Amino acid sequence: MADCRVTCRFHSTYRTRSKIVRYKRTPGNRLTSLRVKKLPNAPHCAETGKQIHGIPRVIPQHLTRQQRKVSRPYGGKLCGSALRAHILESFLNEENQ
Amino acid sequence: ASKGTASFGKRHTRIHGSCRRCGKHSFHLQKHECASCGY
Amino acid sequence: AKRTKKVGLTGKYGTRYGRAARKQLLKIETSQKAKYTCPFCAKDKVRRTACGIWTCRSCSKTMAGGAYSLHTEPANAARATIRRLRLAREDAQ
Amino acid sequence: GRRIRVQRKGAGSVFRAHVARRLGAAKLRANDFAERTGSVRGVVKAILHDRGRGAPLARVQFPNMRGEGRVNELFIAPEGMYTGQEVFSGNKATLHIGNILPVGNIPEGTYVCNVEEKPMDRGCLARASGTYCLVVAHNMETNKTRIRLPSGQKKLISSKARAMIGLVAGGGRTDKPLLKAGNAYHKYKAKRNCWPVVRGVAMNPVDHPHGGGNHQHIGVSSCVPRNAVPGQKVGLIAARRTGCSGGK
Amino acid sequence: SANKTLERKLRLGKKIRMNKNIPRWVILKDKLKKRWNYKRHHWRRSHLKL
Amino acid sequence: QRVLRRLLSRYRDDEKIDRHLYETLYAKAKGNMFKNKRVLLEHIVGMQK
Amino acid sequence: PNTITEENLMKMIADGRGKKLVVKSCSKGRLQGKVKLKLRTAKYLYTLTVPNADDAKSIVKGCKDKVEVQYVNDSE
Amino acid sequence: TTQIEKNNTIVFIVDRRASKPEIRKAFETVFETKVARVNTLITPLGLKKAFIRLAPDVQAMDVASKMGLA
RNA sequence: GGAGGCCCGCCGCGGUGCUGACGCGCAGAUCGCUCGUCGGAGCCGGGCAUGGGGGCGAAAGACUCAUCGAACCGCCUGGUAG
RNA sequence: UACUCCGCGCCCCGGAGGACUGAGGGGGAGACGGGUUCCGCGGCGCCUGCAUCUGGCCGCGGGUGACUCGGGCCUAAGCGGCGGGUGAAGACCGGGAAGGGGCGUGCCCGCCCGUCGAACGGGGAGCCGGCGGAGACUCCGGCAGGCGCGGCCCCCGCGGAGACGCCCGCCCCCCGGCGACGCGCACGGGGACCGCGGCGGGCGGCGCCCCGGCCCGCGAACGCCCCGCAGCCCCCGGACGCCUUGCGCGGAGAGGGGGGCCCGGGGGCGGACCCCGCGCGUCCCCGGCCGCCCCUGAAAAGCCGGGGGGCGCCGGCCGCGCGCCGUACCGACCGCAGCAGGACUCCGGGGUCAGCAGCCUCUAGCGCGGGAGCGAACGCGGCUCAGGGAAGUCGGCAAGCCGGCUCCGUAACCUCGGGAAAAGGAGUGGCUCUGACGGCCGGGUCAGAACUGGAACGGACGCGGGGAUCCCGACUGUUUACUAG
Ligand SMILES: [K+]
Ligand SMILES: [K+]
Ligand SMILES: [K+]
Ligand SMILES: [K+]
Ligand SMILES: [Mg+2]
Ligand SMILES: [Mg+2]
Ligand SMILES: [Mg+2]
Ligand SMILES: [Mg+2]
Ligand SMILES: [Mg+2]
Ligand SMILES: [Mg+2]
Ligand SMILES: [Mg+2]
Ligand SMILES: [Mg+2]
Ligand SMILES: [Mg+2]
Ligand SMILES: [Mg+2]
Ligand SMILES: [Mg+2]
Ligand SMILES: [Mg+2]
Ligand SMILES: [Mg+2]
Ligand SMILES: [Mg+2]
Ligand SMILES: [Mg+2]
Ligand SMILES: [Mg+2]
Ligand SMILES: [Mg+2]
Ligand SMILES: [Mg+2]
Ligand SMILES: [Mg+2]
Ligand SMILES: [Mg+2]
Ligand SMILES: [Mg+2]
Ligand SMILES: [Mg+2]
Ligand SMILES: [Mg+2]
Ligand SMILES: [Mg+2]
Ligand SMILES: [Mg+2]
Ligand SMILES: [Mg+2]
Ligand SMILES: [Mg+2]
Ligand SMILES: [Mg+2]
Ligand SMILES: [Mg+2]
Ligand SMILES: [Mg+2]
Ligand SMILES: [Mg+2]
Ligand code: NA
Ligand code: NA
Ligand code: NA
Ligand code: NA
Ligand code: NA
Ligand SMILES: [Zn+2]
């Protein structure tokens, strides 16, 4: 068609960060609008601010219990590097102390 | 390519509404008081 | 100095504020844009984050320092005085 | 006439401090039994920027001594303090930069900051960026100690008042020109509504005692007495002298 | 507007139901001289304030 | 720049020049010494011989 | 909608979990004279494409009277 | 009437204070039949309108005729 | 390489000159050309706060719903008048 | 900017012709405000500043459907309440006050407000096709999601060298995370749009040419499997190397080889019996960097993890359920009016071009306080003018000159940054050619030559006149809405 202009899909037309769309062609040769949802951040380390490996960027409510866990004693709260320091620090301190 | 007629064109707010005690269009929607009956 | 004779980084101001202000800004801005040696790892990776906040791009250690420069002379004098007064007390308990 | 600018400021309204997005009130740790006998250990967690303030603030975590868990404080950072450092407070704290201890145990000639005028008030004396106090002398008979304030005046305080070793971080801030009117605008937009400033001689008589006339000028002397009533106290209040003397 | 409370909607509903003429059998049953209802309104001329 | 760098990388990864020569030519390319691919190619033969 | 394998087709039909079975004969393009088996389940619609028409008769005859069956065989 | 013939649905006027569950119960008790779903609506003149769709094994047309609507 | 209360310039935001048109007007302040600015002490929408001898003012006695060198409404009040 | 012929009447409807708005729309939709103006049938008494068979006018009947869209919940700036305090009262002010729950009947825990305030902020979950005269993310058909409740079966952890993987426990105390956040020139990726070539289907015109013109060729949410650059991490081992447009990194462990994690995305198969290739640009979103600040760029509900303690099927299949309110239409809103004013936001094709500028146009919409004749003065808005060139006038006011791009050449003075497009010169069309720059065919740009047109080429459009001085204010900025910028 010679015109590809669309109309707003939301209750109002103000374009905030939760009102973003993309365009796709439908089976009836029509151009439609689809929401672009915000992607949440995955959990971040407590000691450092880096991201924790093994967990996807989805809200935890939509994940199974196994998919939001890491198999380590402090898994999901701190990284492997930060856990070594705590183990070394506690042992070396309690040996001298 | 004023303070009169052109400024009347910027009016699209409701200052008063209907009172629940007297029902008289004198309830201030931002003070939450009636200018007529005092509710 | 292929492009300017004397203005240096104060060339962003054109001709707009006078000579005294531009000279003082030259000194201060040169100081505040510089890279400083990290006191914890001896590398020149410390940069300013806010008025008195300095961060290392290697070890990621944050320090409280001066504005425009990591160290100030009054602070060095004070640290030396504290260190001296600390030893005299610990000899006699 | 009508009410002057000074009279309108005191009633609040558009003259209140903008406090949105501020970390909180900076204070020394509260005084308790544990540090009235020994020392309490803490760890510096972060160094942050406070809106409106020129000096940085440090977040320090201490153990909880009346239960379980931890307690988060908010200090004014001395120069040289770094993230991950551990500090002590109490009668037995050691003489290091970040530590808090009573002034009676601090040797004469030391630099201190965030001093408290009266015991257990949590700091009030040297809190602006670059400032510091000096311990001058002790008097064991009366249990009072003399300090020197950043303004140069000398004061006596009780020997049980606490302070922090070092000087406040961020020194040198006022050595750089603001240069532009837009910079002063941002600086004062972080604090309160007080800028820009209109001169009194440029007003009409109805809204300032200095206004009016066929030339811009102050009619009378600008020195007003100490007992002038609120709408009169403009100019130089109870001035001992005027002008650029040049000597000490 | 298209986003109203039920309370405003109910007061505007009564205004519409009342904008009617005098029925023909009423005019002659009561022997009426004035045959128009002067409490009617027109949307282009009125301010209901409701 | 992208053309020159991909050529140099392909030559290093074939062991057609030593890593030291590779670094020197990398710097000379970043210095605006070569105007096109042809001029770089004949320079490499000279340096190699 | 999801694809299903042959072995767990008549198994599902064994546990009485299918609600209907449709047979459609595809004879154009990459679907060259093959047939698609579509089984309606409580949660999903499952479809299998047997590689040849003959395989369809055996399986469907292997579940005859166990689940109701439709035929399409569009020839247009 | 097209609704009755096509979608197995009847359109009724109810009291504004009624909610969907009680309209469903009242329809089931007053006309002995089964109800599948109810949609409601408040009209510009202030009345409440209900769209009542009967259960698949119920012919809406015969109930409509019996009540006299047909 | 890409800084700047930098420059030319569109929409916007303003309002220089013609002392142009109009001046029983399209209009109780508008129209046309020409013009100023256009990454910033920028511009716009909604919510909220400040009330009359009071407010608010980068200051013109400006603005505070066509009203401001002291708003509007009712009453004292059929105020007094050589 | 604008109508005409015929049916039929300058204004309604139809066909044919001729035009316009010109993607910041006289287009298609929302917020606020309006409140039935919406739809069908009939009509011309009023209004539709001319007419009317027309109508937002008059009469009679109709019309707004939600587990998934918004409100109802959260908290912002704020507002209210609070044993009490004060004031002749009305009222106003307010942390120092024996201020609640759980499990289940006895015990245990616990200093102290708000189901107030955002139809743009936060928030658990929806797509396609079709149907009416007026409604649709709401109806019907299909295919899915989320959150609960009830039955039946129904389990208290293994793999890896490691990063981590794979098949799903709850309650309390504490420690955390997500929600959750600035601006910017560039660079890279994805989507949609756009264009070019090929193949299949349809059409138009044709004095001459024409495989050279026009139109069409569609694939969603969701499920499973593969791939996914940059970033971050693991193993071996032990270094002048790796690498960006720019940078940046390395003994606190680089390069190399082999692996893991995330990635708003893509491919395959389903949904659904998929015409084939290629490319520059535009818009939106995302990514890793770098730069900036005496400016550092919200909160809470809700949800989840870890440690310690105490407890115990917790998942699969099959069934049911999801209350209340908004929902038509409009710049039909405010300015006494159907007033050249004012009035927030979303989607944004082709050509010329640096350009979203100016000019013409496809799609869509549409001819608006009425017409005819004549071609005086005079006015309003425009055009040209011999010779002279500010002699006009308080005053170069008004108008005129200049102007795009490329090359050449640019003074005094200066806070050394400027002045500067200083001043001032020359070229520019069409056609036919030549060279240069990539990749294992694409693309435009830049440079040079011959020929040839009334001594012509930024041929419309768009687009600085310049210089020498004095006074005032340093500069960007603000001001008397309606006579002073
Ligand atoms: K001043
Ligand atoms: K007054
Ligand atoms: K809301
Ligand atoms: K609707
Ligand atoms: Mg995982
Ligand atoms: Mg006024
Ligand atoms: Mg407004
Ligand atoms: Mg004045
Ligand atoms: Mg006075
Ligand atoms: Mg004067
Ligand atoms: Mg910039
Ligand atoms: Mg500028
Ligand atoms: Mg005039
Ligand atoms: Mg006139
Ligand atoms: Mg007051
Ligand atoms: Mg046109
Ligand atoms: Mg609409
Ligand atoms: Mg109509
Ligand atoms: Mg009517
Ligand atoms: Mg929702
Ligand atoms: Mg809802
Ligand atoms: Mg609320
Ligand atoms: Mg929202
Ligand atoms: Mg549904
Ligand atoms: Mg509609
Ligand atoms: Mg609608
Ligand atoms: Mg009015
Ligand atoms: Mg209008
Ligand atoms: Mg003369
Ligand atoms: Mg003369
Ligand atoms: Mg002029
Ligand atoms: Mg000036
Ligand atoms: Mg200016
Ligand atoms: Mg004026
Ligand atoms: Mg003026
Ligand atoms: Na400019
Ligand atoms: Na005056
Ligand atoms: Na009177
Ligand atoms: Na036509
Ligand atoms: Na244009
Ligand atoms: Zn009332």
Side-chain angles (χ1 to χ4, degrees), chain A:
Chain A
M1 222 194 85
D3 207 353
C4 289
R5 287 175 288 181
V6 286
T7 33
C8 197
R9 180 105 158 139
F10 305 102
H11 180 79
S12 275
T13 61
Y14 303 110
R15 255 192 98 201
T16 60
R17 48 140 182 238
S18 56
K19 308 257 180 326
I20 318 284
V21 298
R22 44 91 176 266
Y23 307 104
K24 213 84 191 103
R25 209 110 207 150
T26 72
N29 225 332
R30 168 178 71 84
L31 197 79
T32 199
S33 280
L34 305 150
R35 307 204 24 232
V36 189
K37 267 167 163 143
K38 278 129 68 192
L39 204 60
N41 283 326
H44 285 260
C45 187
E47 324 290 41
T48 83
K50 272 205 202 171
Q51 175 179 339
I52 275 158
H53 302 114
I55 295 108
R57 297 186 56 175
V58 200
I59 55 159
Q61 167 188 331
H62 295 333
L63 290 176
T64 70
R65 241 168 307 268
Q66 224 177 50
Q67 298 169 253
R68 40 193 204 228
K69 286 168 145 87
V70 191
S71 293
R72 234 202 324 275
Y74 272 75
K77 201 205 179 326
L78 58 95
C79 42
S81 320
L83 184 71
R84 269 193 28 131
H86 281 82
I87 291 165
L88 285 177
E89 206 228 358
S90 82
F91 162 65
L92 292 158
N93 257 311
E94 201 248 308
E95 181 271 293
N96 299 313
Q97 280 164 230

Side-chain angles (χ1 to χ4, degrees), chain G residues 1-2 17 24 27-28 30 36 38 40 44 47 74:
Chain G
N2 210 353
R17 291 249 298 301
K24 177 188 175 306
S27 64
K28 323 191 289 262
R30 61 186 199 93
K36 292 170 97 163
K38 309 183 177 191
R40 178 77 240 173
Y44 283 103
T47 127
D74 264 14

Side-chain angles (χ1 to χ4, degrees), chain D residues 1-22 24-67 69-94 96-248:
Chain D
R2 50 156 64 103
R3 301 285 146 160
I4 296 333
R5 204 174 36 209
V6 261
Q7 303 184 275
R8 302 205 340 253
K9 273 172 187 179
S13 71
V14 296
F15 292 111
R16 305 193 262 121
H18 328 124
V19 294
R21 301 183 310 276
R22 276 196 196 190
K27 266 138 56 147
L28 288 184
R29 197 191 186 261
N31 203 227
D32 67 348
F33 177 83
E35 73 197 80
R36 270 196 291 265
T37 58
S39 325
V40 173
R41 179 178 157 272
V43 181
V44 175
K45 279 320 219 233
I47 309 192
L48 312 158
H49 166 91
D50 192 48
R51 182 189 178 192
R53 194 186 310 264
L57 304 186
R59 214 201 263 111
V60 184
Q61 208 169 64
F62 287 93
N64 189 356
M65 257 84 51
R66 67 176 295 165
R70 272 125 66 162
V71 173
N72 302 321
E73 272 293 326
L74 196 49
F75 294 174
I76 301 195
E79 180 144 344
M81 162 192 262
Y82 64 96
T83 207
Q85 152 182 25
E86 49 98 11
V87 297
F88 302 82
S89 166
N91 282 25
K92 281 166 207 359
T94 288
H96 285 85
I97 296 280
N99 288 9
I100 291 142
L101 38 141
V103 288
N105 305 337
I106 301 175
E108 288 121 311
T110 304
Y111 293 51
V112 292
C113 60
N114 214 3
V115 202
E116 71 190 15
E117 268 167 341
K118 294 188 177 183
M120 312 208 250
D121 81 15
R122 308 190 69 186
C124 81
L125 287 194
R127 289 167 48 93
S129 81
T131 53
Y132 67 77
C133 286
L134 275 180
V135 182
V136 173
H138 302 298
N139 183 289
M140 267 68 56
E141 311 278 313
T142 206
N143 207 40
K144 285 248 167 51
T145 165
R146 178 106 45 60
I147 59 170
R148 221 265 299 261
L149 296 163
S151 71
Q153 282 157 238
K154 314 248 186 173
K155 207 200 227 155
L156 272 187
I157 64 176
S158 100
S159 271
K160 324 188 75 52
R162 311 174 282 150
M164 207 204 249
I165 320 289
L167 42 70
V168 183
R173 179 174 44 84
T174 50
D175 294 353
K176 175 192 200 178
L178 290 159
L179 186 60
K180 298 160 46 186
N183 283 327
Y185 166 80
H186 292 293
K187 173 191 189 174
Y188 294 112
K189 179 138 160 111
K191 297 149 106 74
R192 66 200 80 85
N193 187 34
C194 62
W195 179 99
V197 190
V198 187
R199 290 168 298 112
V201 283
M203 309 184 177
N204 295 298
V206 65
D207 43 53
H208 203 269
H210 287 182
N214 272 344
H215 304 287
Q216 271 196 20
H217 78 305
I218 304 170
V220 294
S221 170
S222 325
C223 302
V224 293
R226 177 62 82 176
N227 212 48
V229 304
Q232 276 181 314
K233 224 180 265 191
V234 297
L236 317 177
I237 293 134
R240 272 151 211 129
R241 52 160 299 146
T242 43
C244 307
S245 45
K248 268 158 226 73

